[PDB]
Symmetry: C3
Subunit: 61 residues, 3 copies
């Protein structure tokens, strides 16, 4: 069970890397059209959930 929980945590960590890659990609597309001022709340929400996930990953370890 312990070994399996470590595997699941590893999957979650890798999916978080993928999530951040998609966020970065979306930001570049947004920047290509103009200033990103209108996405400041979207950015804040993303930053907040990322902080939450970081805390959970740290705690799981």
């Amino acid at each position: 069970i312990v070994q399996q929980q470590n595997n699941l945590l590893r999957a979650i960590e890798a999916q978080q890397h993928l999530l951040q890659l998609t966020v970065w990609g979306i930001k570049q597309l947004q920047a290509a059209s103009g200033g990103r001022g209108g996405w400041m709340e979207w950015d804040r929400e993303i930053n907040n959930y990322t902080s939450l996930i970081h805390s959970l990953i740290e705690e799981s370890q």
Copy 2:
């Protein structure tokens, strides 16, 4: 083990919020270029997987 499974579920729940934020962001970029009629299947697939995840999160709880 129980406490750890709760933590993993919490991480998955937060990553789901992040996923929905990226979906919303992509939809706004799509809408900026024109009607989203061509993304109706993509929307259906996303809605379906989100339903699946919601069920699993509900079951895990």
Copy 3:
């Protein structure tokens, strides 16, 4: 505990499908603006993390 670990793995598998749908969506938006040559590293990183996740999902099973 075993039943619960299976549920978490299922959630991770469904979220991976969602991640791939967002990646595909981003690629179409990128392609709409021109060639995707500048995203070859982004593609490589995404492909690599996806490979990692596939391995972890296979191992978890």
